[PDB]
Design a protein that fits this description.
This is part of a larger assembly, with eight protein chains of eight kinds. Helix content of chain G is 11%, strand content 20%. Chain H is mainly alpha-helical and 31 residues long. Chain H contains one helix and no strands. The relative contact order of chain H is 0.11. Classes of the chains: A mainly alpha (143), B mainly alpha (40), C mainly alpha (40), D alpha+beta (141), E mainly alpha (731), F mainly alpha (150), G alpha+beta (80), H mainly alpha (31). Bound molecules: chlorophyll A (6 copies), 1,2-dipalmitoyl-phosphatidyl-glycerole, the ligand CC1=C(/C=C/C(C)=C/C=C/C(C)=C\C=C/C=C(C)\C=C\C=C(C)\C=C\C2=C(C)C[C@H](O)CC2(C)C)C(C)(C)C[C@@H](O)C1, beta,beta-caroten-4-one, beta-carotene (BCR), phylloquinone (PQN) (2 copies) and 3 more. One chlorophyll A (CLA) sits at the interface of chains E and B. It is classed as photosynthesis.
């Protein structure tokens, strides 16, 4: 229906259309202000002239939150998975702490370059049972 | 004019009284309980 | 010698090299394509 | 115990010593023999010169005496192990404290009673719900 | 050595130093730790304390009535409640000069007086009290009631009247009496009072203790109550043109349900409040017939608890009756929690659905009451957690509550604390990052790049109740939903009240509200995390697995094992106090700034500056302080001078707490020993000997005093700001 | 030094610095109110802090915006130091225990066992951040104020 | 006065007595460990509670425990 | 109308009662 009636697109917004002609330049490109005037003119705006983002889950604004959410989660899972796998790899080499202080670059890089398939590796470790642990085998404190 | 309310000769005594009453007695009470002492 | 190859691969040197590299990536990306509040 | 024989150490007096309460309530004294005349640091401040042979010094509390005792045997090559710490009452009553049974409490010795000894683990202490409203603690029982 | 202070604990009495005094005060009400205190004398002393405390509350209320009826301009304020400022109490300070004298002679009084901001004039004129003599009679009645309760306590301390321990440990009767009588009968009698006095007084009809037996509150008496038809009390409701205190636009209805706001007073309708109290009185009376007593029929809580088991929860709620019934700290922690939640609810309801006439227009009283109740509740919740930690320390039985839902909480406490930490990080990181991003983006002359998230999930809920400014067309916002065609009498009033752009009923929110709400969520998650890790790890851990043997509050354990500072369950409370104060600062900044925007018609300022922190630091703190700091100037002195002095006073106390909190004891013990030597060597002064050997404040006392000074300087400073900045632009 | 530098900064702006007229008269910035307003704490709170801090908070959109940013940033670091200065490590180690259990649950605990900062190091980080935040606040404030007087 | 206890987990290494600065702790012959000795606390009247014993304990968690109590002139460490 | 002058004096005489009863309860709670 008329979702976000109090919000008008930047293409129709009054204060936004007033301010878009007078946008500053971020980089060295003098058109960058008018570039923003043309780029942000598609989003929904408020009566103040600033763009608003809707994150309720609708696909109309999947470029507002969905794409950065997925891109982050991908890169962050990459980071955490290569870190966890390298931490486990250290546990069998000489001195498990010294190699945590001094990085094994030929090993850390080898594990980083194999992180683009971290979801499949994680599911294969969960089905086999390598991802999680058992409560009866973890050091716990007195209750 | 200070007291537009009834019985304006009460707030006076009431303010001094609380001034030289409650904390005087309070500080003296702890003293008195310190007095029993105990020379063995 | 390996004594310096181990120093260049220590925790602080590597954790600052990665931060410098990621800073370069982000700075150049927001140089060529700045002002990305969302995805078009 | 019977008599506190000893020479007062060479010291020009300091403000860190004993006070009025330390003379009226209780003070502590330590007696030791020095193999020669040397300089030692005062637990109250400064540096004093201990006399040759039997020495005597009065302090405020017991920890000062034991801090001087732990200094005597560790810093000097002719180590002093015969320092004896006494507690002095306002009635002249002097009693023996350190060393207790003539031997330092470090090494073991025959003729001592087990004080504060428990026959359990710390993780075996009783629950505080079982002893509440009683004037006892989980460690006192 | 022992003396006689205190007389309840020999350990504190045998202390020959000054500490003997301090711990003699901080253990005054800790009855469980007294010498030889039994389980029955405990409950009985606590009962007498309850009696005395009810008396104290009633005496405070009696004084509040007395000063209004004596020094207040109640009758004048009744005439013009929208222009005459109320009077709290008169000033009797022999220190005033000329500026304060010329200033405080305000609010129509002929003497230096203090304006009233507790919002009691509106309450008293909404009740029906229109003369000072009614207030005086009520004050005398309360002065008698307080003595009644004092004598009740004194008499119950006697052995013949001493209640038994089995009487105190009766749960199935205390509830049936508190619900049907203390809640049901009280609500019913208050509804009767509202119908018999408030409604007639709203129509010019005076009904007092001299004519209420003859004058009916309705043209038709009690027979139409017996008639199965009840529409006659809906009757002709008070029209939208009704005027308070007069028979103009007034009808004969007493029990309605039309809803909405009174267009003149901008408050709730009296008939609706009386009908509400009647309905909930019936409900509470019904609740008062659930648990069995001396007549067989009824429930037994011990059976209901022990019967609700679970395939995933093991023992369920077994033995929880014998657990809670014997733990006073458990009961106090539940009571404080529920009371704090309903206090925050009272705060969050009175600002948008005011029940008192002309109270919405006075902005300072309304700004003060909300913040007052919110701080009250913020202390109540921390108390609810501090007493749960004490339940774990003193009253938790691991064999009685074995395998139940309570012990499983201890079995997986690591996971609870871990996920609380995760969600607090997940909040803090991004909320702070977005605020810093907005500041960085605005500072660079590019306000067109702010990450402004639209609060969809809350504006949609607003739409589910009739808010059409967003236009979601859901439930009450949609004219075709079956929820509107129900013939509900309250619908037309609610729909008119919600969407009028003049009230505080469901205010229009934006991205700034979203960001401040996530900062509030952080403040809740982290404070609860601290208060929950303090309660769970109150019996032991891996640093101190024997924490249960050391009690609740203790200094530490020593510098060994790496360090043990602030390790007790009391220290966790001490830490979480700061987080509660910070959350209550954030919440109050939010409320006050948005209400300034609503009151000045400048909702745009708040909706367009609350997204970056500089907006708060400047357009709120720096902007609204101008009058505050100008209470006393080198040019003159106005009525804000006392607040201008209290602001700096609160700053001073708050900064004084930092000394106790940053520097610790040993420094001060050495500095004190130097002074002891100084006195015992000063001629004409060593002859001034002391019985109490002066010692430095303990570490626990250090943290307590520092937190107390911090809290005083946190509350007083913000109050001197909130009242002064409000009584200027609108007061 | 916080009072020393404020004494300097206000006495110079009030009884020394100021524009000189071509006739000979000298009009100071704060109109010479130091001798008549710096005698009370409210004078320093209003006519010194509140009055002369306006250049820093209103610096957004200009070349002095970085100074307002660093002003708020020092206000941040100051309060961040209070977490260390008011607490004790015995709580933080018990919390690290739960986070270690969480890491071992997924088997992601470092062989370097995590230990909270020592008591001395806790105090050191506290005082370091206290001084850093305060001096950054005063630096930003002083520079934004001195650059905005012509 | 403070309370000092010694549990059966003690290995009798005299470290807590070598660290005690007020001659509060001793060593009595026992029959539990290789050293055949256990810590003892006869002179609790001289115990200030500086936890120097607990700091110098080797066993998994302490074998000697100090529980602070009613502080007196001697336990407060008063020298004036 | 405003409040009378003698009634303010009647207030202290009545307030004598809660003070006295609170004193009794206070001394009974000390035990
Ligand atoms: C391999 C590194 C690694 C991995 C896989 C994890 C994984 C996890 N951490 Mg964690 N952590 C790490 C390092 C890591 N951490 C470090 C170095 C610190 C010290 C700053 C922490 C401090 C920390 C805290 C305080 C908490 C967690 C928590 C968690 C759990 C929830 C995820 C989270 O909190 O969001 C994200 C995690 C963080 C924001 C913490 C910082 C993450 C660091 C900066 C990333 C490490 C990168 C590493 C160097 C990569 C090595 C690559 C290798 C080839 C050399 C999760 C399973 C939470 C928990 O208890 O579970 C609910 C929690 O409270 N961590
Ligand atoms: C329990 C709440 C309460 C509080 C906080 C106060 C506070 C105050 N009262 Mg008060 N008073 C109270 C209850 C209270 N009263 C009640 C219930 C009565 C009826 C007996 C009175 C009758 C009363 C009188 C007659 C006077 C005060 C006065 C005062 C002020 C002087 C301090 C004083 O000595 O008080 C009073 C001590 C005992 C009542 C002070 C601000 C004086 C005043 O007006 O100051 C300007 C004054 O004259 N009070
Ligand atoms: C932690 C929360 C957070 C989030 C979600 C964002 C998100 C964003 N920031 Mg940002 N930022 C943050 C914190 C955050 N910031 C903080 C704390 C600072 C202060 C140092 C900044 C300072 C900052 C600047 C100076 C700029 C951004 C910009 C941006 C946008 C560029 C995205 C991009 O580069 O394309 C995708 C990247 C790789 C594919 C993006 C939407 C840029 C912008 O123009 O905003 C629209 C930009 O100029 N941010
Ligand atoms: C219909 C009968 C009735 C009524 C009206 C009350 C009313 C009250 N009882 Mg009560 N009680 C009753 C029956 C009743 N009780 C019975 C039968 C028992 C035996 C199980 C108890 C046992 C009991 C205890 C142990 C306590 C109370 C307390 C209270 C007071 C609650 C505190 C308060 O004032 O906050 C406000 C009230 C409503 C908002 C309140 C006035 C408490 C108290 O204050 O002590 C005096 C308290 O400690 N009652
Ligand atoms: C109905 C309200 C209520 C009641 C009856 C109590 C009662 C009690 N509290 Mg308590 N408390 C409350 C609310 C309450 N609290 C709230 C709201 C908080 C949060 C601010 C606290 C936080 C708190 C702490 C941290 C502690 C207590 C403690 C105590 C006990 C000793 C109090 C004392 O004499 O110290 C002195 C009284 C004035 C100086 C006592 C039985 C102490 C205790 O030992 O628990 C058993 C203690 O450590 N309370
Ligand atoms: C402005 C002051 C300040 C700040 C920023 C914090 C921040 C925090 N407190 Mg805290 N606290 C404070 C004052 C403060 N406190 C005070 C005065 C007290 C009373 C003593 C407490 C008592 C307290 C307790 C008891 C607890 C906390 C906890 C926390 C953490 C909760 C996690 C979170 O918020 O998510 C995210 C984190 C943040 C938003 C802060 C990080 C900000 C930095 C700038 C992020 C970027 C890192 C930076 C680039 C590092 C590089 C530095 C480089 C320049 C050298 C958090 C880091 C809880 C905790 O430990 O969490 C589990 C906890 O239990 N606090
Ligand atoms: C908090 C704000 C919104 C945030 C999202 C909500 C999640 C909040 C975090 C809680 C996580 C829950 C973890 C469950 C942990 C868990 O899986 O436990 C397992 C449990 C299984 O219990 P059983 O089937 O054995 O139940 C038998 C009972 O008799 C218990 O003995 O499942 C549930 O309890 C489901 C309900 C969750 C109950 C916990 C929270 C309930 C929320 C409040 C409900 C209010 C209802 C109306 C009351 C008036
Ligand atoms: C619908 C969606 C959202 C709603 C989202 C919903 C409400 C969130 C639901 C969250 C649920 C409750 C939790 C999800 C998963 C919980 C399990 C336990 C995840 C476990 C992950 C662990 C096991 C991963 C571990 C390892 C993974 C594999 C990779 C890492 O590198 C490293 C490391 C961390 C060690 C909203 C907010 C409404 C906005 C809308 O636009 C989109
Ligand atoms: C024989 C009897 C009957 C007749 C009863 C008659 C003829 C009168 C009955 C009156 C009754 C039964 C109750 C009246 C209660 C009045 C109360 C309880 C007032 C309480 C006031 C309180 C508690 C405090 C009020 C306050 C004051 C003082 C203030 O000024 C400030 C506000 C606030 C603090 C609220 C009938 C046949 C009908 C039924 C059967 C029993
Ligand atoms: C420490 C501890 C403890 C704890 C305590 C506490 C912490 C408490 C609390 C609590 C709380 C703080 C709670 C809260 C909550 C929440 C809730 C309860 C909710 C809800 C919901 C609902 C139910 C709703 C519904 C609805 C809606 C949704 C809207 C509209 C209306 C309706 C109704 C529909 C104790 C002592 C026990 C024991 C010991 C330990
Ligand atoms: C100053 C200071 C002292 C010394 C403080 C002393 C000796 C207290 C002196 C205060 C005197 C008693 C006057 C205080 C006045 C109070 C307002 C009186 C309140 C008492 C009520 C009964 C009213 C400490 O012992 C200490 C310990 C641990 C951390 C920080 C500190 C610390 O900062
Ligand atoms: C939080 C806290 C901790 C815990 C503090 C910790 C664990 C420090 C966290 C350090 C993290 C792991 C490193 C992040 C900070 C880096 C030094 C910044 C370097 C960034 C570069 C790599 C760019 C204490 O140990 C403590 C001790 C005594 C009193 C108070 C406290 C206290 O408040
Ligand atoms: S607590 Fe300190 S003073 Fe007491 S016995 Fe142990 S080491 Fe000695
Ligand atoms: Ca009337
Ligand atoms: Cl001034």
């Amino acid at each position: 229906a008329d979702d976000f009636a109090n919000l008008t697109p930047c293409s129709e917004n009054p204060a936004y259309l007033a301010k878009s002609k007078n946008f500053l330049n971020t980089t060295n490109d003098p058109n960058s202000g008018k570039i923003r005037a043309e780029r942000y003119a598609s989003a929904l705006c408020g009566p103040e002239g600033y763009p608003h983002l809707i994150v309720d889950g609708r696909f109309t604004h999947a470029g507002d939150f969905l794409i950065p959410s997925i891109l982050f989660l991908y890169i962050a899972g990459w980071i955490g998975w290569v870190g966890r796998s390298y931490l486990i790899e250290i546990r069998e080499s000489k001195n498990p702490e010294m190699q945590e202080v001094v990085i094994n670059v030929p090993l850390a890089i080898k594990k980083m370059l194999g992180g683009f398939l971290w979801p499949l590796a994680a599911v294969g470790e969960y089905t086999s049972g390598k991802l999680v642990m058992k409560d009866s085998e973890i050091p716990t404190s007195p209750r | 004019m200070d007291g537009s309310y009834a019985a304006s000769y009460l707030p006076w005594i009431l303010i001094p009284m609380v001034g030289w009453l409650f904390p005087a007695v309070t500080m003296g009470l702890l003293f008195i309980h310190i007095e029993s002492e105990g020379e063995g | 010698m390996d004594g310096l190859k181990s120093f260049l691969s220590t925790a602080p040197v590597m954790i600052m090299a990665l931060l410098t590299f990621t800073a370069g990536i982000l700075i150049e990306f927001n140089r060529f394509y700045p002002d990305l509040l969302f995805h078009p | 115990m019977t008599e506190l024989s000893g020479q007062p150490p060479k010291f020009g007096g300091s403000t860190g010593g004993l006070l009025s309460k330390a003379n009226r309530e209780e003070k502590y004294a330590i007696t030791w023999t020095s193999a020669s005349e040397q300089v030692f640091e005062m637990p109250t401040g400064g540096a004093a010169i201990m006399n040759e042979g039997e020495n005597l010094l009065y302090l405020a509390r017991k920890e000062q005496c034991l801090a001087l005792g732990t200094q005597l045997r560790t810093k000097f090559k002719p180590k002093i192990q015969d320092y004896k710490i006494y507690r002095v009452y306002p009635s002249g009553e002097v009693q023996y404290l350190h060393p207790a049974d003539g031997v330092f409490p470090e090494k073991v010795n025959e003729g001592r009673e087990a004080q504060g000894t428990k026959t359990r683990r710390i993780g075996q202490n009783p629950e505080p719900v079982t002893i509440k409203f009683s004037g006892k603690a989980p460690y006192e029982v | 050595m022992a003396t006689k202070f205190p007389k309840f604990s020999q350990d504190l009495a045998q202390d020959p130093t000054t500490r003997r005094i301090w711990y003699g005060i901080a253990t005054a009400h800790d009855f469980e730790t007294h010498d030889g205190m039994t389980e029955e004398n405990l409950y009985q002393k606590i009962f007498a304390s309850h009696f005395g405390h009810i008396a104290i509350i009633f005496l405070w209320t009696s004084g509040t009535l007395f000063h209004v009826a004596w020094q207040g301009n109640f009758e004048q304020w009744i005439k013009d409640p929208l222009n005459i400022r109320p009077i709290a109490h008169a000033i009797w300070d022999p220190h005033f000069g000329e500026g304060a004298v010329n200033a405080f002679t305000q609010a129509g009084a002929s003497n230096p007086v203090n304006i009233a901001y507790s919002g009691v004039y509106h309450w008293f004129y909404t009740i029906g009290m229109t003369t000072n003599q009614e207030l005086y009679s009520g004050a005398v009645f309360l002065l008698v009631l307080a003595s009644l309760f004092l004598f009740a306590g004194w008499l119950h301390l006697q052995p013949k009247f001493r209640p038994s321990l089995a009487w105190f440990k009766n749960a199935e009767s205390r509830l049936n009496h508190h619900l049907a009588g203390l809640f049901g009968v009280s609500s019913l009698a208050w509804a009767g009072h509202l119908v018999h006095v408030a409604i007639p007084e709203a129509r010019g009809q005076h009904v007092g203790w001299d004519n209420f037996l003859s004058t009916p509150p309705h043209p038709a008496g009690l027979m139409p109550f017996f008639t199965g038809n009840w529409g006659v009390y809906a009757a002709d409701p008070d029209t939208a043109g009704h005027i308070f205190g007069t028979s103009e636009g007034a009808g004969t209805a007493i029990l309605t349900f039309l809803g909405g706001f009174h267009p003149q007073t901008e408050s709730l309708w009296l008939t609706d409040i009386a009908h509400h109290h009647l309905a909930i009185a019936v409900i509470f009376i019904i609740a008062g017939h659930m648990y069995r007593t001396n007549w067989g029929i009824g429930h037994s809580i011990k059976e209901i608890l022990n019967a609700h088991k679970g395939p995933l929860t093991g023992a369920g709620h077994t033995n929880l009756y014998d657990t809670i019934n014997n733990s006073l700290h458990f009961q106090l922690g539940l009571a404080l929690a529920s009371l704090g939640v309903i206090t925050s609810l009272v705060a969050q309801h009175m600002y948008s659905l005011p029940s008192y006439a002309f109270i919405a227009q006075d902005h300072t009283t309304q700004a003060a009451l909300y913040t007052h109740h919110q701080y009250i509740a913020g202390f109540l919740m921390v108390g609810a957690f501090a007493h749960g930690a004490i339940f774990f320390v003193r009253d938790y039985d691991p064999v009685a509550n074995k395998d139940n839902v309570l012990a499983r909480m201890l079995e997986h406490k690591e996971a609870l604390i871990s996920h609380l930490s995760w969600v607090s990080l997940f909040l803090g990181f991004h909320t702070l990052g977005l605020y810093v991003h907005n500041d960085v983006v605005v500072a660079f002359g590019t306000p067109e790049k702010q990450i402004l998230i639209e609060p969809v999930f809350a504006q949609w809920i607003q739409a589910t109740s009739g808010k059409a400014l967003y236009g979601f067309d859901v439930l009450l916002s949609n004219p075709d939903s079956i929820a509107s065609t129900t013939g509900a009498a309250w619908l037309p009033g609610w729909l008119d009240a919600i969407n009028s752009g003049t009230n505080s009923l469901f205010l229009t929110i934006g991205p700034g509200d979203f960001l401040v709400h996530h900062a509030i969520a952080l403040g809740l998650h982290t404070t609860a995390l601290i208060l929950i890790k303090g309660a769970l790890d109150a019996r032991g851990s891996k640093l101190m697995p024997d924490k249960k043997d050391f009690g609740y509050s203790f200094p530490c354990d020593g510098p060994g094992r790496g360090g043990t500072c602030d390790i007790s369950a009391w220290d966790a409370f001490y830490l979480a106090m700061f987080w509660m104060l910070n959350t209550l600062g954030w919440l109050t900044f939010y409320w006050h700034w948005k209400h300034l925007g609503v009151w000045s018609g400048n909702v745009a300022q708040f909706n367009e500056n609350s997204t970056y922190l500089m907006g708060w630091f400047r357009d709120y703190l720096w902007a609204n302080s101008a009058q505050l700091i100008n209470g006393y100037n080198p040019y003159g002195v106005n009525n804000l001078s006392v607040w201008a002095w209290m602001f700096l006073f609160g700053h001073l106390v708050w900064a004084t707490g930092f000394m106790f909190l940053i520097s610790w004891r040993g420094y001060w013990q050495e500095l004190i020993e130097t002074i002891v030597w100084a006195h015992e060597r000063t001629p004409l002064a060593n002859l001034v000997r002391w019985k109490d050997k002066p010692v430095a404040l303990s570490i626990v006392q250090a943290r307590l005093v520092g937190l107390a000074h911090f809290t005083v300087g946190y509350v007083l400073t913000y109050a001197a700001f909130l009242i002064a900045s409000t009584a200027g632009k609108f007061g | 030094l916080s009072i020393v530098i404020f004494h300097f900064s206000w006495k110079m702006q009030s009884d020394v610095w100021g524009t000189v007229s071509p006739d000979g008269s000298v009009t100071h910035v704060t109109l010479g109110n130091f001798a008549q307003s710096a005698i009370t704490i409210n004078g320093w709170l209003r006519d010194f802090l509140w009055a002369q801090a306006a250049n820093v908070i209103n610096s957004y959109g200009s070349a002095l915006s970085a100074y307002g940013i660093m002003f708020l940033a020092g206000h941040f670091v100051f309060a961040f130091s209070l977490m260390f200065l008011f607490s004790g490590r015995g709580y933080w180690q018990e919390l690290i225990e739960s986070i270690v259990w969480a890491h071992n649950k997924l088997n992601v605990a470092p062989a370097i066992q995590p230990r909270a900062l020592s008591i001395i190091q806790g105090r050191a980080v506290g005082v370091a951040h206290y001084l850093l935040g305060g001096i950054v606040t005063t630096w930003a404030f002083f520079l934004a104020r001195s650059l905005s007087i012509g | 006065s403070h309370s000092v206890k010694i549990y059966d987990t003690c290995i009798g290494c005299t470290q807590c007595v070598r660290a005690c600065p007020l001659d509060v702790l001793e060593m009595v012959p026992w029959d539990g460990c290789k050293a055949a000795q256990i810590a003892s606390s006869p002179r609790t009247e001289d115990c200030v509670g500086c936890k120097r014993c607990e700091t110098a304990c080797p066993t998994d968690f302490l074998s000697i425990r100090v529980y602070l109590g009613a502080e007196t002139t001697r336990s407060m460490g008063l020298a004036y | 109308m405003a409040l009378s002058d003698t009634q303010i004096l009647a207030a202290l005489v009545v307030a004598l009662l809660p003070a006295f009863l609170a004193f009794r309860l206070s001394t009974e709670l000390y035990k």
